Amino acid sequence: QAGYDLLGDGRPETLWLGIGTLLMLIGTFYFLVRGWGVTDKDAREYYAVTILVPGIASAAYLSMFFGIGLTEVTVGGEMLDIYYARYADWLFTTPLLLLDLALLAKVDRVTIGTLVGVDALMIVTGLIGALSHTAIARYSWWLFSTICMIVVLYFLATSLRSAAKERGPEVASTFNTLTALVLVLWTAYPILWIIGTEGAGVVGLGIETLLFMVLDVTAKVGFGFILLRSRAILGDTE
Ligand SMILES: *C\C=C(C)/C=C/C=C(C)/C=C/C1=C(C)CCCC1(C)C
Ligand SMILES: CCCCCCCCCCCCCCCC(=O)O
Ligand SMILES: CCCCCCCCCCCCCCCC(=O)O
Ligand SMILES: CCCCCCCCCCCCCCCC
Ligand SMILES: CCCCCCCCC
Ligand SMILES: [Ca+2]
Ligand SMILES: [Cl-]
Ligand SMILES: [Cl-]
Ligand SMILES: [Cl-]
Ligand SMILES: [Mg+2]
Ligand code: NA
């Protein structure tokens, strides 16, 4: 795989996991330090939610870097590497990102429950796809998981967007900027999975790990930088 076997254990993808670990850790500490001076009760909630996103991802990347939670899955005569920590990371961090958006839009708890429930289902069925032993099963789960993602993104772009507009231009402009980023960046994840080792196998584990790392840092640290710079986080939350 494209990369460099940093720990001398046969895994060139640790170069990218290590860089990912460091960027997530720096993002976490930067948010933490800037949050210590925040006193507004609403801004403190956004900070609390948002620091945990790269913070949890830091733990997951450190675990992958050291090889904890790595195993192999046999599909016919090939053996695919599966890092479990990647899916546990996304299981926790994607609801937290969705919670940031839902706080900005100020939508009700049943809407939030639907959004995070479909999101959880997306991650779980992706994991089932990653562990499945026939190509037909792996592509079928991927398709179902992708449908779940489309549902989540549809709700953001319609119901939450409409709610956010009623909160005024600072909230609506921040919501719209973050949602523009999410609609593009989250969609990149199923594309990479199906062209990478889990799917068609055009891209190998090295390039795949590099690109997931770039997506992850952007989706977590980049997202948080745009959010936490905005005056919208001072507005009332429920
Ligand atoms: C770490 C932060 C984020 C926003 C991670 C997002 C991950 C996804 C949107 C993954 C989606 C998948 C789909 C829709 C299909 C099955 C395979 C995936 C789990 C990669
Ligand atoms: C390589 C980048 C590809 C990006 C493709 C982005 C397509 C996102 C589609 C998600 C569903 C959008 C739901 C409706 C959105 C809207 O009403 O504007
Ligand atoms: C360590 C982060 C690397 C990846 C970061 C990708 C996203 C760039 C973040 C800088 C955004 C610049 C300031 C906010 C811009 C805006 O409001 O849209
Ligand atoms: C002989 C090993 C040298 C390997 C050099 C790695 C490529 C340069 C590092 C660039 C990593 C950029 C990551 C993107 C950050 C979002
Ligand atoms: C031959 C295996 C079929 C895989 C199960 C179907 C998954 C339903 C979405
Ligand atoms: Ca306030
Ligand atoms: Cl403040
Ligand atoms: Cl206050
Ligand atoms: Cl590769
Ligand atoms: Mg309130
Ligand atoms: Na290594």
Residue numbers in the entry: 7 to 244
What do the authors report?
To validate the versatility of the VIALS workflow, we used two different IMPs, archaerhodopsin-3 (AR3) and the human adenosine A2A receptor (hA2AR), as proof of concept. AR3, from the archaebacterium Halorubrum sodomense, is a light-driven proton pump that undergoes a sequence of conformational changes induced by the absorption of a photon and is commonly used in optogenetic experiments. hA2AR is a class A G-protein-coupled receptor that is expressed in the cardiovascular, respiratory, immune and central nervous systems, and is implicated in immunosuppression and the regulation of sleep. However, the production of integral membrane protein microcrystals in lipidic cubic phase at the desired crystal density and quantity is challenging. This paper introduces VIALS (versatile approach to high-density microcrystals in lipidic cubic phase for serial crystallography), a simple, fast and efficient method for preparing hundreds of microlitres of high-density microcrystals suitable for serial X-ray diffraction experiments at both synchrotron and free-electron laser sources. Using the VIALS approach, room-temperature structures are reported of (i) the archaerhodopsin-3 protein in its dark-adapted state and 110 ns photocycle intermediate, determined to 2.2 and 1.7 Å, respectively, and (ii) the human A2A adenosine receptor in complex with two different ligands determined to a resolution of 3.5 Å.
Here we report two room-temperature AR3 structures: the first, by SSX, is the dark-adapted state of the protein; the second, by time-resolved SFX, is the 110 ns photocycle intermediate. With a crystal hit rate of up to 31%, a full data set was obtained within 2.5 h using only ∼60 µl of crystal-laden LCP. A total of 11 912 frames were successfully indexed in the space group P212121 and the high quality of the diffraction data was supported by the figures of merit R split and CC1/2 of 16.1 and 99.2%, respectively. The AR3110 ns final structure was refined to 1.7 Å resolution with an R work and R free of 18.12 and 19.64%, respectively. The resulting electron-density maps revealed the presence of 61 water molecules and lipid fragments.
